[PDB]
Amino acid sequence: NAQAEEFKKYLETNGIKPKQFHKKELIFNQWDPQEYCIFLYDGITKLTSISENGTIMNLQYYKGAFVIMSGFIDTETSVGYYNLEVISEQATAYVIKINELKELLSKNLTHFFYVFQTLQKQVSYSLAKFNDFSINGKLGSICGQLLILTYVYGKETPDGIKITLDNLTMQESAVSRIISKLKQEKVIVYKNSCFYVQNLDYLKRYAPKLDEWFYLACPATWGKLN
């Protein structure tokens, strides 16, 4: 991705260097008084929050290249008590303190826009998820999630498009029943610990807005299976 490449070069150009991250490490955490702008160049991460009780809730996942900012750009205060945990074996990420990002942004705008538009994809993603769910109930949400996973991780195979995410993350009541429908309907097939798809257009039929969103936000990866 040329645009993502560009951002990676530009920060280094100014004196910032990448950091490597092993699985389970937190690039930032919810108890840090300092907020950070993370440019996740490679690897997979998840956002998590911790309750009073101490239970972990997974709220979202990020694949590189992407930008995750734990603080408001202006006030420098937390946007939410969240942690960014690595779930891939390793991840490379540039960790910028939120007060330092504005100096770089004081210099140039092009790059600033790249980060602005990553938020827009996040915003529209949540809107797309709400719409599909409302339209196609729980069937739409999971097929929505399977289709996104199929667009990003989908590998053409004679058996069907393999969701190339291992058992670790693939395993990460009603959901079991809906999945049984999918397998019964021959839309999905589960061999060698990870789902395969044979009715891509069934997922597309019940998550249409989400399919629209991938087309509008990530038009190259969408091309792969359409």
Binding site: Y62, K63, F66, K121, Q122, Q145, I148
Partner: peptide
């Protein structure tokens, strides 16, 4: 990309 984003998901979930």
């Amino acid at each position: 990309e984003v998901f979930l």
